[PDB]
Symmetry: C2
Subunit: 187 residues, 2 copies
């Protein structure tokens, strides 16, 4: 493939940060510093990762050029993101307005952190990938630039607090999806 | 006097930041970058400012070497600080434990800012002078280092918010002192 082993490794690290990654190849390329690559080359590599995991899991490993891919690890990351993929709108206008529909416990960032901040953190994780805290901070529309990752390393929320909060919010989404499925009677 | 006109001017700027300044000559010297000066030289200059204001106000101006001192301006600053001078303990152990005894309205710093933060801001103003926000931030015991003057200029409280808050708290102290004088019947 028209990629180096180092480029394949960056692609796989970024692929693991999203749900439905084959529909997020430009966000993956941006995150993996592969913006220069063609849409056809990105689609080909993404489908090698997607199809490789299916073949290995129908732990198990597979190769992409000289890179060894842990199929269980990719899919464990994808499973953790299922509630986010199912909850956040794919439509951009709708996504901008997304609000978490359930009550959230206090964040304890020693700051004002409310429902809209939780909502924008989840939109940022959808847009930039799980763990892409600097990219979410740099987004000029999510209103987190002057809230997250303070310059002062003793002030919250730093990456640790964002990871804790994000994991809590994604678990809340999982519980909410199950409750809505049970209440509606629609599987 | 054993001081330059530039040194006299720094001394007067720092003198205006305290109540009972003649009892705060070391804090004045620290603030005015005059730490090198002897206690006798500092006392002599301070008494020239104190006695000069009395003579001019028994606007009116007086001279210290080649420096023109506005007596009304010095005394207006000293009057604004009367409630702070009368409320904060002069004893160091007691001062460390000082808590504002009345209810304070919300600060709107978009952070957690409570009674102890207001109290420590007032102790810092007493110790370092009105407007000495960086010195108060640098104090390792007042617990404001990671709260005030954020590195991010869009985050609060910056100097503007500290000035607004301090003026509000000193007015609250003035009202509290008058109420306690009326309630006790002791002038």
């Amino acid at each position: 493939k028209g990629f180096s082993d180092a480029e394949i490794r960056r692609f796989i690290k970024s692929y693991k940060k999203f749900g439905g990654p084959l529909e997020r190849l430009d966000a993956i390329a941006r995150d993996a510093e592969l913006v220069d690559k063609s849409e056809t080359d990105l689609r080909r590599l993404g489908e090698l990762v997607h199809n490789g995991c299916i073949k290995a899991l129908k732990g198990p490993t597979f190769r992409i050029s000289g890179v060894q891919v842990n199929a269980k690890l990719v899919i464990s990351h994808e499973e953790e993101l299922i509630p986010l993929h199912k909850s956040i709108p794919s439509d951009p206008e709708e996504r901008k307005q997304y609000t978490i529909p359930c009550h959230t416990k206090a964040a304890h960032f020693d700051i004002d952190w409310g429902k809209e901040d939780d909502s924008n953190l989840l939109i940022g994780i959808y847009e930039y990938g799980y763990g892409s805290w600097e990219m979410i901070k740099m987004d000029p529309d999510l209103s987190l630039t002057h809230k997250i990752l303070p310059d002062d390393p003793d002030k919250k929320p730093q990456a640790k607090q964002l990871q804790t909060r994000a994991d809590y919010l994604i678990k809340l989404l999982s519980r909410d999806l199950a409750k809505k499925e049970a209440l509606s009677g629609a599987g």
